[PDB]
Amino acid sequence: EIVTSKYQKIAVAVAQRIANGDYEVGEKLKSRTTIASTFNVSPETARKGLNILADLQILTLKHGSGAIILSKEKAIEFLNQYETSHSVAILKGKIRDNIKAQQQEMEELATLVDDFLLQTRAVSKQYPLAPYEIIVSEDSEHLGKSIGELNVWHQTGATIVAIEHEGKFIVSPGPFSVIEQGDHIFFVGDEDVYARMKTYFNLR
Amino acid sequence: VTSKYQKIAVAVAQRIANGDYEVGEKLKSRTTIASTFNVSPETARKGLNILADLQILTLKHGSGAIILSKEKAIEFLNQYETSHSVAILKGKIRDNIKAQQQEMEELATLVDDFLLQTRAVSKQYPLAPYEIIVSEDSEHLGKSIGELNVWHQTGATIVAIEHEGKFIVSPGPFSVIEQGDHIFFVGDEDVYARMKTYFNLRMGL
Amino acid sequence: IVTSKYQKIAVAVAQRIANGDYEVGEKLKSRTTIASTFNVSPETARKGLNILADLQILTLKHGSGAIILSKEKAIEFLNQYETSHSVAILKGKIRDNIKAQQQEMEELATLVDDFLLQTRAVSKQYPLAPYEIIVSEDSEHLGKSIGELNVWHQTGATIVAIEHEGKFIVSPGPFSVIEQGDHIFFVGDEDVYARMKTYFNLR
Amino acid sequence: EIVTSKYQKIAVAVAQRIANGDYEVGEKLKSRTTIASTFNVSPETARKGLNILADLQILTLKHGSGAIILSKEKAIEFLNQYETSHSVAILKGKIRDNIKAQQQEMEELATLVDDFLLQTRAVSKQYPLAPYEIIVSEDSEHLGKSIGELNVWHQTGATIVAIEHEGKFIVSPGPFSVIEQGDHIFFVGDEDVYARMKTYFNLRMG
DNA sequence: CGGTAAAGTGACGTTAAAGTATCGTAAAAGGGTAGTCACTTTTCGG
DNA sequence: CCGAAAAGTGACTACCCTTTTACGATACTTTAACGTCACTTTACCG
Ligand SMILES: Nc1ncnc2c1ncn2[C@@H]1O[C@@H]2COP(=O)(O)O[C@H]3[C@@H](O)[C@H](n4cnc5c(N)ncnc54)O[C@@H]3COP(=O)(O)O[C@H]2[C@H]1O
Ligand SMILES: Nc1ncnc2c1ncn2[C@@H]1O[C@@H]2COP(=O)(O)O[C@H]3[C@@H](O)[C@H](n4cnc5c(N)ncnc54)O[C@@H]3COP(=O)(O)O[C@H]2[C@H]1O
């Protein structure tokens, strides 16, 4: 997710304090070791954060001395740009997460289409008396009705051989079997009957 | 297609060009660069090798980095930016997004035919139908499936009739069963027993 | 959680057994011959034959080959394989994947929109570097607007900003007034700079 | 872009000949080196192509007797089966080209947006001013006109500092400089002036 | 009171460690190769 | 004319080579800490 440098984190924190006014312009800061203990960091790590601010003309520290705040206006500008552009950073990170996730989806797609082709080949390899099958997952006035109430053969030309409901099968279902949403209908007919069944159950 | 070494180069060229490093001021070479940019000394060294190759600085003094000319640093910045991507980078990203949008449209249509080329989905379950040859005399011959009311008589769902070697799939109630036809139907073993009895086939094993 | 060629071998051989092409008594060819017929490794063929062995469709205690065991259990295995593998279920997954990818790209499009909006355009760090003069000398051109002076036609300069009493107006237009002591920021070349200096009596 | 084993090619070729009738049913496909010489291929790749044929039950094999042709109807059916499924597989191979190019453009997008962030922080470190740069790449009633004819400052609030045309820059352009399609316009102003310039030159660009 | 020297503290620079990424090597599998094995056909001899 | 032997070819198999994928190791980069150096302040002495 979001990771920044600890050095940067310290720099941003102290720059925010300066911009808020805790450290006024011209405020002395003979520091290193004291603020290092405030931040529970090695005294040396403190400078790693405060000379980056000096080259950026936010403060001035002579050798062996304390940091003197220089420009309120420029420290404010820098802190603002950094935080709003670290929001630029968070948006950037979300784009990289999104594109990597999409590469993950497209890799799954690759294996799916290879697997799809493999199954189409293996399924064709038999041919005893293959029937036609659909999943009635869309809303339709034909759901919650029995096969006889629908009068299926007269509506679509299909002969239903089996209904799968909640993973269970009824073969040779008869007129009293009910077709419910999500059920699988196995049926025989030709390509036109398959097309009729798809339209009849609002499947495309 | 770029690494942060270029960014270092631009940053230090910017300092030189603004006048932050006065004309002829010396840097502490790798140590100063690493302390400033947080970049490693090995990348930094190539970063400054860039400005050496363009004569913005000289490194023949192991001590550090001597800056040479502010005018050449400004030249560097300009050509660098123009040959790289800034407002072009915004345009390139837009072009990339639109190219991928078109590629996805092509993909959507490809898959449509791929899926529609499957004009049906089969199962090859054990639901494959029993086959009986109605070769014996029977009161049921010469009648239509609907007149017989077959499912209610035997529990069978007829999927096809073979008559004179020709098949009718999904036969409906008006198809007639004639002597010698083959009836294909789904059911279980008990449905098979009912069909065999119904059509006077008790002789068959 | 379903990817295998050995399963394709398993179903193929089970379909042969169940249809009756391979009678019960009959022996299958060598594990190496089946691997070559199905164009795969002997090891994957070993997995396929182990599948039907675990389902008691074949036994391999003989080196000559695999002996067929049960035609009905091959049929029993075809039913279970149908369930596990699934047919249009596979197609449906591809449609869902495509739909999810389209939504992910819509999210990406909007993300980039804000990223690019930012708030403004950009910069090319050009030597456009605008000149600055301070109009501190007396001049008949002071107390006049940029349009009244017709500056570009007089000096070749394009004024980008005026500083007046320490405050800035950027893109000033023809109605902005140049007063004594103001700073004029402008673009042009060295000759334009020279014209501006002379024009405002800065020699 | 085609990856069918050599064996499989050999099988298809000889099966096609059988289905055409060049190799009749009782006629024996004898001479294995002689079959290798027919296609100038190795005799063992040919022998195995024929073996895969024999195992799909198109021809029968036996010592001393060249492969005898068994069934016309089934060899014909199998030829047609390979004809459909192989093009199905080629269509599958196509979606692969799409996913590959798109993954490449995503890896490309990732680098582009990383550098875009790099540019934003780099330009945030500016000097007195950074003029907005627009590329007038869209069709517009304003193209082919001079800055003075357009009366740009009064239309948009922008002061144009330079035009880039055919890679050449004119600084301090004046009213007689013309804006042509594809030019880069550099101008000063604020965020609102930028919005006016973008609208004025038909750059909504969604 | 002024100057000098010493000590202490803060900063800067350099080096080391840890984590992540990339590349190379190795292993496994899938597909082609020649050697061997057997069977059938042809020729010769009885 | 029939039988036997030899030769040629089909059938068989163990193997080898090539390609792809996965894992491991090395390298690089970033962040932290130890050490050393400089500057400032104080105290003491002249
Ligand atoms: N292929 C077949 N196999 C076995 N028997 C068949 C049959 N076709 C028709 N019948 C029999 O004839 C009756 C009328 O069939 P019909 O198709 O007109 O009218 C049918 C049909 O439109 C529909 N239906 C019933 N089962 C169906 C199924 N499995 N598939 C499609 N439609 C079915 O409900 C109506 C009443 O069905 P019900 O079973 O009470 O009554 C059925 C049934 O006893
Ligand atoms: N670089 C530019 N960017 C944007 N628009 C430009 C432009 N150059 C010319 N125009 C537009 O064309 C009009 C006539 O410009 P011209 O240079 O002849 O006549 C100008 C010019 O001599 C002078 N002027 C105005 N603004 C100026 C400026 N920022 N710098 C220098 N001269 C300016 O006053 C006259 C009237 O100015 P006004 O703005 O009413 O009208 C301007 C303006 O609308």
Author numbering:
A (entry chain B): 7 to 210
B (entry chain D): 9 to 213
C (entry chain C): 8 to 210
D (entry chain A): 7 to 212
The article reads:
BusR satisfies the overall domain architecture of the GntR family with its N-terminal winged helix-turn-helix motif (wHTH) and a C-terminal effector binding motif, an RCK_C domain (regulator of K+ conductance). Our structural data, supported by biochemical and biophysical data, reveal that BusR utilizes a unique domain assembly with a tetrameric coiled-coil in between the binding platforms, serving as a molecular ruler to specifically recognize a 22 bp separated bipartite binding motif. Binding of c-di-AMP to BusR induces a shift in equilibrium from an inactivated towards an activated state that allows BusR to bind the target DNA, leading to transcriptional repression.
One structure contains BusR bound to pAB1 at a resolution of 7.1 Å and the other structure was determined using the whole promotor sequence (pAB, two BusR binding sites). While the resolution of the EM density is not good enough to determine the register of the DNA directly, it can be deduced from the lower resolution BusR:c-di-AMP:pAB1 structure, as the whole dsDNA density (46 bp) is visible. Compared to the crystal structure, BusR undergoes major structural rearrangements upon binding to dsDNA. The Helices αG2 and αG3 of wHTHinhib plunge deep into the major groove, in close contact to the motif sequence, while the ‘wing’ of wHTHinhib (loop between βG1 and βG2) reaches into the minor groove. In this complex, wHTHfree faces the DNA in the same orientation as wHTHinhib but is positioned one quarter of a DNA turn (90°) further inwards, towards the middle of the DNA sequence. Based on our structure, wHTHfree appears to be limited to phosphate backbone contacts.
